[PDB]
Structure 1
Amino acid sequence: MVTIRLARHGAKKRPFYQVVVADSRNARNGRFIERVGFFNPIASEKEEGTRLDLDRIAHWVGQGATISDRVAALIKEVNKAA
């Protein structure tokens, strides 16, 4: 089963997640098909806080990927009319 999920990179007390498409049986930092965008939870207001390419995400939705709760919250953050 494919899924779109965060990967938990960064340092101790310095999180930096990687939204990525991967199988559920693989590891969190393990093998992935391809990466699309990123998220930084400590990215308070500066030049860039979140990049997220919606084309490949819509392509993986067209394939059957299960979106997790944080990635769905990022989809509701990157709104089509906002």
Structure 2
Amino acid sequence: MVTIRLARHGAKKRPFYQVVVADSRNARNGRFIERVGFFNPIASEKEEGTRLDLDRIAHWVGQGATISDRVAALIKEVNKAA
């Protein structure tokens, strides 16, 4: 089952999640079809927040992929009308 999920990287005590499409059987740091955006929770308010390429994600929703609840919240945080 293909799914969109954070890959979790960065320096120790410095989380830097990597939203990416990958089958569930794959490891969190393992093989993935393609990266799409990134999430930086420790970034706080500055020039960078949380890029999110909805265009490629809109294609995988029709491919049957199951967005994770973490990425699903990012779909709301990016909003539509806002």
Query: TM (normalized to structure 1)?
Result: 0.98
Please state how far the C-alpha of 1:53 moved relative to its aligned partner: 0.6
**Cα deviation code 1:40-73 (max 9, x no counterpart):** 0101110011100101000000101101111000
**Cα deviation code 1:3-41 (max 9, x no counterpart):** 000001011110000000000000101000000000001
Query: TM (normalized to structure 2)?
Result: 0.98
What are the ranges of 5 or more consecutive residues in structure 1 without an aligned counterpart?
none
Q: CA RMSD in A?
A: 0.5
Runs of 4+ in 1 over 4 A off after TM superposition: none
Q: How many residues align?
A: 82
What are the ranges of 5 or more consecutive residues in structure 2 without an aligned counterpart?
none
Higher helix share: 2
| Matched-pair identity in % | 100
